[model samples]
Target: HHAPAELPKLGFNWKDGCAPVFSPRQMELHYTKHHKAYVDKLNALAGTTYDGKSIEEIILAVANDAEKKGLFNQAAQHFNHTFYFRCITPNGKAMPKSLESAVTAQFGSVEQFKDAFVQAGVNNFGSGWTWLCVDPSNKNQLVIDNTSNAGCPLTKGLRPVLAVDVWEHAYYKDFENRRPDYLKEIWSVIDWEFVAKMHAQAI
Candidate 1:
């Protein structure tokens, strides 16, 4: 007899211990309500029609199919929100050695990386994400890219090490319409160790 299929774990929880720099209420709602809803919808739609495919596979398939636009948006947003949550830590720490060196080598300094990253967030056109990605075309260089709702750098062969969600809901309660303030504040809670490890894996 075959073992039962195990559902993929979301990998994080909604306890106070796991709160981001944002308020606990905001993180709770973002994870349990917003992110959960997307996952639920994606699972429901993909289970029947695209069963047995990986999440990324379903997202890419639906993304390329204009007729399946709804599925694409839900699946991609589900994936993006999940990654964004894991990217943050309430007790922000210094950049890890490998990432720090990469930042200095690529952007001249950690301060420069922060400046460029925050600028990308401040100037994002709409409710989207700002990412620090490894450019596949040039391994020594890093790229900053923004994607409109549900867009991801992985779809373009870039490896995303860090991300900031610039959607209104991400900062509306804390910073109101001043996205720059929110952008500035978020750095204090960034999980640089996580980013560094991701970059190490990429190499």
Candidate 2:
């Protein structure tokens, strides 16, 4: 029943505005119940045999093994949820100094970054995630990517800077069919501090 003592915190809080448009209760249930279920299932499957491995390690191992699809799904979901939760915040701030130059250099301006990011979300076909990731090969070029279902940025070796959960359960209760509105509203709460720190660490 015991598992690794250092399992990541899922790095989120009940009051944070990760999904500002959604009610507090909706975000709470999504994180505590839905997201927690994925982590619980992942730990249950890996703890017995893969106890010491980092969550990323376990996910990569399972992802590479076709026979471990179930484990892969759970592990990837757990990682995605954790990272996705970090991208939100209650107070909106402009991009940090560390990230500002990078954003300007890579995307011309912050607005361009938002445009590309929202387009990725709008164009995504089904339950998935939209990411702002560093190009693994270059690091200087930021890229927008989409992953269907449990797919994640780790699979491509790109460090995920921020993520927006695109699953219907993430927004349907509040935003319903107006996903663009949800996307627009979410920007106000983005944790630029967290994102800046991650970008600095990556570089």
Candidate 3:
């Protein structure tokens, strides 16, 4: 059997859980129920055909295999959720100047980028993730993408700098059908420092 996959530790205190933006109850359930389920499912694949590969390796290798679709979805969901949690924090840090300059160059302004990002999440047809990614093919330029159902940018060779889960399970507890409201408020908890780090890594 492969090494067991564990749920990642929440970087911030559980008491805060980016409160008001993501309520404690919301965060608890999302982590314990939704996110844990993904991790557990990935672990279940350990002794099967998925053994001996890293989670990322499995995701990339199985992504196009029709028979491996379930494994791909489970592994990608675990990866996506972990990255999403890493992108947010109890305190939202200011965007680093270099990353800000890159964003402005690509999208005109920070506010414009936010608007486009929120709209992308709103327009996503169903369960998925909305992302700010580095387009490897375009000289690592910043771009927004909406990926449906466990879709991940790595599969396309894009580097995801930020991810917002749009699944109903993500926001329904607090927003209750107000997806746009949730998306708009999410910026308050976004850890720009982490995002900047990812942006730098991508470049």
Candidate 4:
């Protein structure tokens, strides 16, 4: 229902995460190049017909139409990518108290929750996203939910707190086909502050 904001200037330098995780060039291409394409394309596509509709509305409204997949994909890709960028930080944030409790209640322990999140990324098969979402239907429980292509949880009424892109483009530049390695390394940059806000909203 609101206009999409400008691409957020990343809070950290391009090389903040670095080598064993994401290199500067890879981060540059992923942020300045690929993610921007979705931003530009979706803005070009939205108009009077879409003016008052939220990004999620646009996604769910067109999600079922094979003919509109191009449009759906663009909006959802933009939507998801923006959220994805917000999930990371320079050195990352410590998991907040209530959020830590939420994770433990749902996944037994913090280490286990991260393991399941990374596993979802590893097992996602092709290009996709792995998310830590609060399931409204399950009493706002945190759950690891992964989806293929432009799939997003908002479409299913779940609220995503953290997301990792498992698309090759997200990692091929860094890990090649080693998705498991990418999965293993990404946690070091997670934005727990961003996640805590999302968790608060979900409840």
Which has the greatest lDDT? 3
What are the TM-scores, per candidate, against the unseen true structure?
Answer: 0.88, 0.90, 0.95, 0.91
Q: Each candidate: what lDDT?
A: 0.74, 0.78, 0.88, 0.83
Q: For residues 1-203, could you state the per-residue lDDT of candidate 2 as single tens digits?
A: 12342234534557453444557776877787788788778877776787867778877777778889888888888788878777775655568877988888888999898988898998899889999888869844778889999998888898888889988878776788888887877888788888888787777
Ranking by lDDT: 3, 4, 2, 1
Candidate 4 C-alpha lDDT tens digits along 33-78 = 8888877777777656777677888888888788888878888887
Per-residue CA lDDT of model 1 for 1-203, tens digit only, reads: 00111222433444553444577667767777777777777767666666666666766666668888878887777767766776777667688787888889888888888888889898888889999888868854677888888887878878888888998888776678999988888888777887888788776
Leading candidate by TM-score: 3
Candidate 3 lDDT at 163 equals 98
Tell me the alpha-carbon RMSD of every candidate. Answer: 3.6, 2.7, 1.9, 2.0
The 10 consecutive residues of candidate 2 with the worst lDDT sum are: 1-10
**Candidate 2: which stretches are off by over 4 Å?**
1-20
Q: What does candidate 3's lDDT look like per residue over 19-44, in tens digits?
A: 54888888988988898898898878
Q: Give the TM-score of candidate 2.
A: 0.90
Checking candidate 1 for backbone clashes, the offending pairs are none
| Alpha carbon deviation, residue 85, candidate 4 (Å) | 0.5
